[PDB]
UniProtKB/Swiss-Prot annotation, chain C:
Cytoplasmic dynein 1 acts as a motor for the intracellular retrograde motility of vesicles and organelles along microtubules. Dynein has ATPase activity; the force-producing power stroke is thought to occur on release of ADP. Plays a role in mitotic spindle assembly and metaphase plate congression. The chain holds residues 3264 to 3427 of 4644 of the full protein. Disulfide bonds: none annotated. It is linked to Defects in Dync1h1 are the cause of the 'Legs at odd angles' (LOA) phenotype, an autosomal dominant trait where affected animals display unusual twisting of the body and clenching of the hindlimbs when suspended by the tail. Heterozygotes suffer age-related progressive loss of muscle tone and locomotor ability without major reduction in life-span while homozygotes show a more severe phenotype with an inability to move or feed, and die within 24 hours of birth. Belongs to the dynein heavy chain family. This is Cytoplasmic dynein 1 heavy chain 1. Homodimer. The cytoplasmic dynein 1 complex consists of two catalytic heavy chains (HCs) and a number of non-catalytic subunits presented by intermediate chains (ICs), light intermediate chains (LICs) and light chains (LCs); the composition seems to vary in respect to the IC, LIC and LC composition. The heavy chain homodimer serves as a scaffold for the probable homodimeric assembly of the respective non-catalytic subunits. The ICs and LICs bind directly to the HC dimer and dynein LCs assemble on the IC dimer. Interacts with DYNC1LI1; DYNC1LI1 and DYNC1LI2 bind mutually exclusive to DYNC1H1. The lineage of its organism: Eukaryota, Metazoa, Chordata, Craniata, Vertebrata. Dynein heavy chains probably consist of an N-terminal stem (which binds cargo and interacts with other dynein components), and the head or motor domain. The motor contains six tandemly-linked AAA domains in the head, which form a ring. A stalk-like structure (formed by two of the coiled coil domains) protrudes between AAA 4 and AAA 5 and terminates in a microtubule-binding site. A seventh domain may also contribute to this ring; it is not clear whether the N-terminus or the C-terminus forms this extra domain. It is found in: Cytoplasm, Cytoskeleton. The gene is Dync1h1.
Amino acid sequence: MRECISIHVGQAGVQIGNACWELYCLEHGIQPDGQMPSDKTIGGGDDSFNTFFSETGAGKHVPRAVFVDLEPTVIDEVRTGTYRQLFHPEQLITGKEDAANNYARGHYTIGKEIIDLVLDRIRKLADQCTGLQGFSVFHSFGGGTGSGFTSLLMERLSVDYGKKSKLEFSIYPAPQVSTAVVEPYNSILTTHTTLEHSDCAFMVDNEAIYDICRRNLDIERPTYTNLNRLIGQIVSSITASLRFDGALNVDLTEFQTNLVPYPRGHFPLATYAPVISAEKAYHEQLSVAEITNACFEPANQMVKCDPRHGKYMACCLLYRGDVVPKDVNAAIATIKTKRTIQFVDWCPTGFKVGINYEPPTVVPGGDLAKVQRAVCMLSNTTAIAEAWARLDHKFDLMYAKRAFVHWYVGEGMEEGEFSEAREDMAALEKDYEEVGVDS
Amino acid sequence: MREIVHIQAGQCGNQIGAKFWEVISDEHGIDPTGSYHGDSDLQLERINVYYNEAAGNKYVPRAILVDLEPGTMDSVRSGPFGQIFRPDNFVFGQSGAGNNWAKGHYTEGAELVDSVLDVVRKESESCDCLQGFQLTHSLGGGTGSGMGTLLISKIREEYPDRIMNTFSVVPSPKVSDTVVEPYNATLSVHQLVENTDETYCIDNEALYDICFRTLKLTTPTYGDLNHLVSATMSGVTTCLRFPGQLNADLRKLAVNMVPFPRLHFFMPGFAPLTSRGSQQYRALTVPELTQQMFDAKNMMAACDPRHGRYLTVAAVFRGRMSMKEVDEQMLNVQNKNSSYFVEWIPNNVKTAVCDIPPRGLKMSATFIGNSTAIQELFKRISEQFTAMFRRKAFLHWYTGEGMDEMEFTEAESNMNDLVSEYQQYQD
Amino acid sequence: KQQEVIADKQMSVKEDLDKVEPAVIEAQNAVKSIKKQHLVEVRSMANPPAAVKLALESICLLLGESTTDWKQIRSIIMRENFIPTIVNFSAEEISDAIREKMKKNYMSNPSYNYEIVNRASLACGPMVKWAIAQLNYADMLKRVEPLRNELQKLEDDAKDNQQK
């Protein structure tokens, strides 16, 4: 109690934390600086002054998360904004950039230059990991620094922090579904390295979140600024419902014991209930069943593996807000006994579930407001041969027609490493055909 | 801040140069005599883009005022935005504009290299922030042909280690019968391909055809048309230094322009408009932007890639617009040009976008094309040559002012290699 | 009778050279003649991989600049004299000191090796295969030079015996 220091990289990753922080502030009623005049009130944390008093406190106020940006503008938005005493300026880092979307750049070429300063911050952040759980990290997964620097670093953190929890929060379209033929080239090498060195990753599909925003939530301007606030409101409806509230409050280690039951990071694909136009415009309250039916609504459920198919292992759904026992049992039970859902023949139980008891208390204006009920959703299908096959197919697909690997070798990466990684995806595709046909 | 220097070669490289300076200073709040009219963000940060603030809110240029002769410097120093700061920034020296490429690439080039280089070596080390150099050029006679090619060989020897981006205006590419000049002009191209890293070539007649039609005036003054180009350019360089998630930087942008390793040729196009500089309706929405890109006629340089493949592209936008209306429109306008962008990669797309307008413009953009199946250009240089190779009585000038024939046959071969490399890009 | 046996033995020495010379001289010629294919693979790679920066440093020793000085190398490559400078280190006109720097050091170490330089790059591996084959033809034109000097000496003795 409470959560645990949160670290943020990337253009979405820092702002996903910035929007979620606005929601901590909004729920707390916190002052930029003071002093806050209520007994006590919670959001960052359960104390409310010296501001933030985010468990982390005193000094010029010691921060409970860290932002590495490149822009003075986000720093002004803290320092002359709200957040001014809720971080101290010694940990507000603002740097310079040079862009590649290449693994080799991020890992090597700028990667061995910028590292030392931020390594000295990370060693201290590990030294003073308040909350004590582990690293919770935003990403920044498909860029140049994204793909290669996180290779370099995640292997470093897996090395030196082998008992420490590591939860990776990433935005990433489903494989081969993005337009560009070459785009898998830097990322499939990270996907190889994190095939060995990762065990938890929370995934959000960018194409699905953009269409959801365009038609379902029905927004005239989808922008990545609104997507940042959108996925920060998803992450908030996990994090502020399990942290210490009127809730069942599942420690993330015993949760990861459910996420990975068996060797290989068994990541689940993620989605949210009320990312729709009627909820946006303000809707009926809705029961425990009615809000699962909200998360069911067309395209809020992924069609990656086909609508109800792909050999379901389990689905995990996380019921925020006040809750009635009978109704929650109805909510999980009806999709299973109507049995449209294709499960694995080895185990079609579906007992994995989370429920929490605390209504949202935030002031209406964005995409999330004061409601007494919500839900977050995680799909696990065992027939995901398709993901690994579509990394291998899409890589070869530029190649089959013209040569191209030579450029990333030209950034300092090995040439046979790509052949082998493509092959490991195609190997893994076989292994996953085994689990997606099952016993 | 970026702190760019402009290198402007010959009378044509200065024409564009100048009709950029007025507008660029003005939008970043530098006032004609070096004072201040700012108080918007770029006219406070971004601001020292070609400038520095100094002496009680006056503006020293980072791109200093250099010219060759005094009456041209009188036009630069009367300004309007070129009067800014006390005498140290004003530089001029010698003179040129000659003929005979051989004379210009040797004897009559070397003294004028000598007059340029010392001040460049003194300036070049002394810029700390300097992210890269903007280059503009002239093909004016034996100086801008002969000497300009001699000069860039010395500049790139001197600086392999700097970012140099070369914009070049041309009289419509190789459209006119040419005497014995093909074996000289390929040797000029030879020296251009072995001393250039990023190239952009702009067609005078296409812009005059755009002037006759779109901009609704039959008179095509190129000092006016080089303003339009440059104030449009104002929307490009500063776009990518305003915030926005697609506004990429160095190492990405480099490989974005070169998908295949050998020297490319980029062509600027035109983008939102039905006019600029006539009407009170000039066009600006996402459909009106997509219409000139997915046309054919606005683009520069008479050597048509477009038939053989439609290859790679980028569009740099300024103005608030719906990002998914852009990508929805983009899906439909790309469903036009499909596989045949290069059928190794169905669909070639790239974009960059900033929320915040440019000038009295609500929305504007630019369009950039690249070069595949244009081999016709380098057949043509050979097809013109035939008559006054056969009836030749003209090679001996260029030769008796320092040339010789091995260089002509070595140049001819790279013109044929060019014909192959476009044949091979059509493949 | 002795002179004609002189003549047969000189023919037998050139026959021993003849085995190894036409494949190595085709490779050693191919580079020297600056074909398109060969030049493209040379003019590649902005950041060499790790074993390939070791290789480049060794190519710049052949250039004269002792190490992988990119800014120097970038400038001289796009200048006509870079290949001449390097190919002057070919054949028996590689220095024996460089051949021993190469052999006792670089090609007594996995780090400059075909295996490691071909895994590191598909261009770089065959350049190492040409570079080492040209360095063994170089060495052969030094240490199989007693065979060529024997074919030479059998010719010179034969001419001396014409005049005696």
